[PDB]
Amino acid sequence: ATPFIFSEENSALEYFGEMLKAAGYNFYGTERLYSGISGLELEADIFIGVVYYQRLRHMVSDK
Amino acid sequence: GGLTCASAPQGTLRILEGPQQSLSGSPLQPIPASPPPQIPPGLRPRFCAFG
């Protein structure tokens, strides 16, 4: 994920899209989600993936 | 031992070391382009749908 290695003729979405097409999943990262408060299928497909979150020290005030 | 004066000098030759020839090559030598990323060989669906 180094900057400036993806051009405009070899994009960053025509690369990982083809990586996901090779892994069976959707080209655009959108997986079909059901619900849990109802039980049936959401009709607009939902973008899911793995994102490295962090955690700030700027905590809740406890005051 | 009188050391009399003389006339005005016409020109002043300046001796100096020559320019550094054959230091730079006639083609240029650039850092090669970092390659575009490849789709790796041997990619297959490892996830089967359950049931």
Swiss-Prot record, chain A:
Its localization reads: Nucleus, Nucleolus; Chromosome
Assembly and binders: Component of the RNA polymerase I (Pol I) complex consisting of 13 subunits: a ten-subunit catalytic core composed of POLR1A/RPA1, POLR1B/RPA2, POLR1C/RPAC1, POLR1D/RPAC2, POLR1H/RPA12, POLR2E/RPABC1, POLR2F/RPABC2, POLR2H/RPABC3, POLR2K/RPABC4 and POLR2L/RPABC5; a mobile stalk subunit POLR1F/RPA43 protruding from the core and additional subunits homologous to general transcription factors POLR1E/RPA49 and POLR1G/RPA34. Part of Pol I pre-initiation complex (PIC), in which Pol I core assembles with RRN3 and promoter-bound UTBF and SL1/TIF-IB complex.
Please list the coiled coil stretches. none
**Identification of the protein by name:** DNA-directed RNA polymerase I subunit RPA2
- Please describe what this protein does: Catalytic core component of RNA polymerase I (Pol I), a DNA-dependent RNA polymerase which synthesizes ribosomal RNA precursors using the four ribonucleoside triphosphates as substrates. Transcribes 47S pre-rRNAs from multicopy rRNA gene clusters, giving rise to 5.8S, 18S and 28S ribosomal RNAs. Pol I-mediated transcription cycle proceeds through transcription initiation, transcription elongation and transcription termination stages.
Q: What does its UniProt record remark on the domains?
A: The active site comprises the fork loops, the loops and the rudder that stabilize the transcription bubble and assist polymerase translocation.
Name the gene behind this protein.
POLR1B
Illness: Treacher Collins syndrome 4: A form of Treacher Collins syndrome, a disorder of craniofacial development. Treacher Collins syndrome is characterized by a combination of bilateral downward slanting of the palpebral fissures, colobomas of the lower eyelids with a paucity of eyelashes medial to the defect, hypoplasia of the facial bones, cleft palate, malformation of the external ears, atresia of the external auditory canals, and bilateral conductive hearing loss. TCS4 inheritance pattern is autosomal dominant.
Give the record's family classification. Belongs to the RNA polymerase beta chain family.
From Swiss-Prot, chain B:
Modified-residue entries (Phosphoserine), positions: 26, 34
Residue ranges, annotated region (Disordered): 18-41
On the tree of life, the source organism's domain of life is Eukaryota
Cell compartments where the protein resides: Nucleus, Nucleolus; Chromosome
Q: Where is the composition biased (Pro residues)?
A: 29-41
Record's function text: Component of RNA polymerase I (Pol I), a DNA-dependent RNA polymerase which synthesizes ribosomal RNA precursors using the four ribonucleoside triphosphates as substrates. Involved in UBTF-activated transcription, presumably at a step following PIC formation.
Extra info from the record? Answer: It is in an antisense orientation to and overlaps the gene of the DNA repair enzyme ERCC1. This gene overlap is conserved in mouse, suggesting an important biological function.
Q: How does it assemble?
A: Component of the RNA polymerase I (Pol I) complex consisting of 13 subunits: a ten-subunit catalytic core composed of POLR1A/RPA1, POLR1B/RPA2, POLR1C/RPAC1, POLR1D/RPAC2, POLR1H/RPA12, POLR2E/RPABC1, POLR2F/RPABC2, POLR2H/RPABC3, POLR2K/RPABC4 and POLR2L/RPABC5; a mobile stalk subunit POLR1F/RPA43 protruding from the core and additional subunits homologous to general transcription factors POLR1E/RPA49 and POLR1G/RPA34. Forms a heterodimer with POLR1E/RPA49. Part of Pol I pre-initiation complex (PIC), in which Pol I core assembles with RRN3 and promoter-bound UTBF and SL1/TIF-IB complex.
Tell me its family: Belongs to the eukaryotic RPA34 RNA polymerase subunit family.
Name of the protein this chain belongs to: DNA-directed RNA polymerase I subunit RPA34
The source organism is Homo sapiens (Human)
- Residue span relative to the full protein: 103 to 153 of 510
